C-alpha cells in the first residue's frame, strides 16, 4: 500500500534518465534540422530531468527515514520542482498541439512562428511564467508553512484557505485551460485535414472522369471542354500544393503539376488543330505522369494521419498522467471550501500525486510520434 510511490519512482528514474537523455539528443538533432518542435521537446526533456534528479531522495525518504532529514528547504525546493515539472510539461504539450494546429490549418499564414528562434522565445516566456507562478513561496516562507509541513513533506491535511483557492486556480488554469486548448486544436486539426483530403478527392474525380470522356470522345469540342476542366482541376490542386515553408516534397509535387499542365496544354493545342491523335496523346501522357506521383501522395496522406495521431496521443498523455491528480485535488478543494471517504480520499490523492510522475515517461515517447 505504502510502497507504491517508491516503486513507481524507481521505475520512472530508471526509464526516464536514459530516455530523457536520448530525447534531448534527438530533439537537439531535430533543431539542427530546423524543426521547431525539437525546441519544445528539448524543453520538455530537460524539465523531466530536473524532476528526476530529485526522485532518488524521495524514494530513500520513503524507504529509510521516518521524516525529512534534509530540512525545510529541501522540501520547499522539491515541491517547487514538482509543480514546475507538471506545469512546464502541460504548457509545452499545449504549445506542441497549437503549432501542429497552425501548421496544418494555416500553413501559409503564421510561417514566422514555425521557426527555431520563435520557439525559443516562446519557451523562454513559458519558463519565466511557470517559474514565477510557482516561485511565491521563495519570497515568503509563511506560504510554505501554511501549505506544507516541516517534519514530513506533504501538504497539510486541512487547507488554510488560500491553499485550496490556489489549488482551484491551478486545476482550472494549469490543467483545464491548456487541456481545453489541446482538445480544440485536435478537433481543428481533424477538420483541416479532412477538408484538405476531401478537396483533393474532388479534383481527382473531375480529372478521372474528364480523362475517361477524352478516351471515348469523338467530336473535338468535347475533348476541348474535357481538357478545359482538366486544367482547372490541375491548377486548383497545385494551389493546394503551395505551402509557405517550401518543403522538399511539395516542391516535387509542384514540378509534377507543372509537367501535367504542360502536357494538358500540348494536348489542348493539338486538339484545336483538329488532329484526333490528341486522344492517345493525353491518354498516355497524363497516365504516365500520374503513374509516379501517387506514391508520394500516399506518403503525404500518411503524414497527415500521423499529425492526427500526435494530437490524440498527446491529449491521452495529458489525461492519463495528470487527470487523476487534478481530479482529486479539485475534490479535496471542493470539500474545504464546502460541507466519509475523506481520508479515504487522502491515499488516492497521494497515489495520484505519485502517478503524475509518469509524464517523465510519456515525454520521451513523443519522439516516436514526431518522427
Amino acid at each position: 500500500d505504502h510502497l507504491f510511490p517508491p516503486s513507481l519512482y524507481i521505475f520512472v528514474i530508471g526509464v526516464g534518465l536514459p530516455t530523457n537523455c536520448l530525447a534531448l539528443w534527438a530533439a537537439y538533432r531535430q533543431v539542427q534540422q530546423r524543426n521547431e518542435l525539437g525546441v519544445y521537446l528539448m524543453n520538455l526533456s530537460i524539465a523531466d530531468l530536473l524532476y528526476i534528479c530529485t526522485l532518488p531522495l524521495w524514494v530513500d525518504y520513503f524507504l529509510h527515514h521516518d521524516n525529512w532529514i534534509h530540512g525545510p528547504g529541501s522540501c520547499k525546493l522539491f515541491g517547487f520542482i514538482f509543480y514546475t515539472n507538471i506545469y512546464i510539461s502541460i504548457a509545452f504539450l499545449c504549445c506542441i498541439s497549437v503549432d501542429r494546429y497552425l501548421a496544418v490549418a494555416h500553413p501559409l499564414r503564421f510561417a514566422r512562428l514555425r521557426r527555431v528562434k520563435t520557439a525559443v522565445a516562446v519557451s523562454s516566456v513559458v519558463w519565466a511564467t511557470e517559474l514565477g507562478a510557482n516561485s511565491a513561496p521563495l519570497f515568503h516562507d509563511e506560504l510554505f508553512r501554511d501549505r506544507y509541513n516541516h517534519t514530513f513533506c506533504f501538504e497539510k491535511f486541512p487547507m488554510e484557505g488560500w491553499v485550496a483557492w490556489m489549488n482551484l486556480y491551478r486545476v482550472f488554469v494549469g490543467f483545464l485551460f491548456p487541456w481545453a486548448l489541446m482538445l480544440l486544436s485536435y478537433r481543428g486539426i481533424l477538420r483541416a485535414v479532412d477538408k484538405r483530403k476531401a478537396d483533393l478527392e474532388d479534383n481527382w474525380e473531375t480529372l478521372n472522369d474528364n480523362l475517361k470522356v477524352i478516351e471515348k470522345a469523338d467530336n473535338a469540342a468535347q475533348v476541348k471542354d474535357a481538357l478545359t476542366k482538366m486544367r482547372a482541376a490541375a491548377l486548383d490542386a497545385q494551389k493546394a500544393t503551395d505551402k509557405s515553408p517550401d518543403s522538399p516534397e511539395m516542391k516535387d509535387f509542384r514540378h509534377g503539376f507543372d509537367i501535367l499542365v504542360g502536357q494538358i496544354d500540348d494536348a489542348l493545342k493539338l486538339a484545336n488543330e483538329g488532329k484526333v491523335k490528341e486522344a492517345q496523346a493525353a491518354a498516355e501522357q497524363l497516365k504516365t505522369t500520374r503513374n509516379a506521383y501517387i506514391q508520394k501522395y500516399l506518403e503525404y496522406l500518411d503524414g497527415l494521419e500521423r499529425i492526427k495521431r500526435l494530437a490524440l496521443s498527446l491529449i491521452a498523455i495529458v489525461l492519463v498522467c495528470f487527470a487523476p491528480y487534478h481530479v482529486l485535488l479539485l475534490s479535496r478543494s471542493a470539500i474545504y471550501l464546502g460541507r466519509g471517504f475523506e481520508e479515504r480520499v487522502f491515499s488516492a490523492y497521494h497515489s495520484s500525486l505519485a502517478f503524475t510522475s509518469l509524464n517523465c515517461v510519456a515525454d520521451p515517447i513523443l519522439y516516436c510520434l514526431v518522427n
Partner: antibody
Amino acid sequence: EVQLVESGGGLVQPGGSLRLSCAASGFNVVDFSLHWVRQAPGKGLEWVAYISSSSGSTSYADSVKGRFTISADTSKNTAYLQMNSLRAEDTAVYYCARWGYWPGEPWWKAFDYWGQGTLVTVSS
Amino acid sequence: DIQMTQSPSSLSASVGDRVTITCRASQSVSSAVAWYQQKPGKAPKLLIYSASSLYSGVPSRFSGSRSGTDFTLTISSLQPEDFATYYCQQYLYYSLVTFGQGTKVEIKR
C-alpha cells in the same frame, strides 16, 4: 523597356483586307504568346487571335475563323494579323497583348503588356 | 465557352468610398481570373492576377479573391484616379480566353 507597338490600321472597304503589325521591344516575339484583343466602339473586350511562335500554335475566335490569319516573324521581332474578307462588324480597336508561357508567373500574370492599339474601320 | 458575368455593370461611388465588383464564372475556373483597369482611349492595365495578387506598380487599394466560381474585386478606398472600367477575365487556356462585360465605376453625385 517592354513595348508592344501596333501599326497598320486604317480604313478598308468591306470584303477588303488589312495587315496589322505588332512590333516588339525589350522582349522577343518568340519569348511569349501574342494575342489580339478587339474592342468594338462602345463595347467590351473580345479575344480574337493567338499565336505562339515558340510552338507554331495559333487559334482564333469563332467570329473570325477562316477569315483572319495570324503569323509572326521573329527575325524582325514583329507579329502580324492578316485580316481578309472584312465585314462591318470587324470595326474595332485592335490591341496586341503579351501573355507568357506556362509554368510559373509569366503565365499567371496574363495580359501584362498591351500595346497602344490600332483602329480598323470597315466601311463602304 | 466559359462565360464570366459581372453583376454591377455600373457602380456609383464617392471618392474615399468602398467598392466591390463581383464576377461569376459559368464553370469551375481555378484562381485564373484577372482584373484589368481601362481608362478611355487606353489599353487595359493589369491590376490583379490569379484572382488575388497585385501586379507590381498597382496601389494597395486594390485587392480581390475567389470563392468557388465567384470572384471579386475590391477597391478599399477610391481615389480620383480609379474611375475606370474594370474587366473580369478568365485565363484557363490560350484559346479559351473570355472577358466579362466590364463594370464601370462612376463618380457618385
